[PDB]
Amino acid sequence: QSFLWNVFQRVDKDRSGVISDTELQQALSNGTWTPFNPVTVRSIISMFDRENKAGVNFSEFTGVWKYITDWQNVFRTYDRDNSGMIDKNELKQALSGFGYRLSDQFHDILIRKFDRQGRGQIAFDDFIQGCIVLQRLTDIFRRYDTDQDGWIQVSYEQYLSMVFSIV
Amino acid sequence: QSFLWNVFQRVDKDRSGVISDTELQQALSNGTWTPFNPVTVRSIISMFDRENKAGVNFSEFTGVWKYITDWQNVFRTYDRDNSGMIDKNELKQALSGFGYRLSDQFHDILIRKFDRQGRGQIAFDDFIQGCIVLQRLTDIFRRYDTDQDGWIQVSYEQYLSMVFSIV
Ligand code: NA
Ligand code: NA
Ligand code: NA
Ligand code: NA
Ligand code: NA
Ligand code: NA
């Protein structure tokens, strides 16, 4: 815990015992010399903050640290030329490793939706956000696919509630 | 146009000929003495700005003005006690007037999703945002409901693209 405590003290710049969105963003590198995607930061804090305080305490931060390190290790695996972005094939391999079953064309769609750099590849911070969204959307789809055939049938109002649950 | 020009000059506080999100928000009342929902502001500017400039010029602003006034007139109709919020029954009537076909229970869901004031009713600014979202989601549903029976059948990847189109 000593290592993690030392890291926590450095990130918690106001020394309040709660790391904010701004503090976490400032402590994170996306490997492209631009500020770490604040939407990704918001997602991560929101997932690990158990008390609706717009931040993480030390115990929650240990979760954040492991989460971010785990994502780093995935991205490091697949960014084969260490360019700071992964291409459609590298992304394909990454997501297939997770068990996703997606067509070649979908990988282009995902890159376009989340790549803030406008290069047709995806940087680390944007990759986490895309994956978070993909996981949430896939969890929701799994709930409605009652016979596991890769299709859902939903009414207008089921659909509205489905979209509202994203969130 | 004279009236609209005079209004435009007053809202365009920096006198640049482009009204920003912050300028529009500052010029709008939600009737509850709290700042007008910035998400609603973002939606409205984004819809009327034809040039990706984070704002509206005078001609676009005439559209904004009409849009906001039209919404005001709907809300004024249905806020029968002039309290500044509409209840589930008032909302039901409002949306039915638009031609929406929604169950009584859905109106509770919509209020919960969009009411920032936490009163179980919905204020003007939040009502616009809810309606904007409802219209977009209903347009998307209409695209997929190929036989107009109020149901859709979609594959996993169709569903992902559907959600990605929201936006
Ligand atoms: Na802090
Ligand atoms: Na690369
Ligand atoms: Na199914
Ligand atoms: Na201005
Ligand atoms: Na009322
Ligand atoms: Na149908």
Curated annotation (Swiss-Prot), chains A, B:
EF-hand domain location is 1-34, 35-65, 66-101, 102-137, 138-167
Substitution effect: F98G: Increases interaction with PDCD6IP. Impairs interaction with ANXA11
Task: Tell me the compartments it is located in.
Answer: Endoplasmic reticulum membrane; Cytoplasmic vesicle, COPII-coated vesicle membrane; Cytoplasm; Nucleus
Tell me the residue numbers annotated for binding Mg(2+). Answer: D145, D147, D149, W151
Q: Which UniProt keywords apply?
A: Acetylation, Angiogenesis, Apoptosis, Calcium, Cytoplasm, Cytoplasmic vesicle, Endoplasmic reticulum, Endosome, Magnesium, Membrane, Metal-binding, Nucleus, Repeat
A GO term, aspect molecular function: protein dimerization activity
Consequence the record notes for mutating G99C: In a breast cancer sample; somatic mutation
* Binding sites annotated in the UniProt record for Ca(2+) 1: D12, D14, S16, V18, E23
Pfam entry (one): EF-hand_7
Q: What does this protein do?
A: Calcium sensor that plays a key role in processes such as endoplasmic reticulum (ER)-Golgi vesicular transport, endosomal biogenesis or membrane repair. Acts as an adapter that bridges unrelated proteins or stabilizes weak protein-protein complexes in response to calcium: calcium-binding triggers exposure of apolar surface, promoting interaction with different sets of proteins thanks to 3 different hydrophobic pockets, leading to translocation to membranes.
Q: What is this protein called?
A: Programmed cell death protein 6
Organism this protein belongs to: Homo sapiens
Gene that produces this protein: PDCD6
